[PDB]
């Protein structure tokens, strides 16, 4: 990993009708915002290898209300030991839980939203 790729993190969201969660994903000397979405598919937030071990990026799921629809997902792992570039982190806020895997195949439930 020398040239590498801007790593884009997928915040997936899908319980079904009226799934809405507002993910605040910012860290690592870089700002994005705090957006909600409807149950559609993917919501992709993108960064480059600047938000490394410095403070990486974390997406926190909340809603315009009390904490209610809440959870706390790590968009990126601050491990420079493992190669990124061709890597993608998918956390999905789905019917069951919040998923957490940087894979090529479907991820695993490792976080959980609320409501």
From Swiss-Prot:
Its main location: secreted. The keyword Secreted applies. It comes from the Eukaryota. One of its GO terms (cellular component) is extracellular region. It is found in: Secreted. Keywords: Secreted, Self-incompatibility, Signal. One of its GO terms (biological process) is rejection of self pollen. Belongs to the plant self-incompatibility (S1) protein family. This is S-protein homolog 15. It comes from Arabidopsis thaliana. The gene is SPH15. The chain holds residues 21 to 132 of 132 of the full protein.
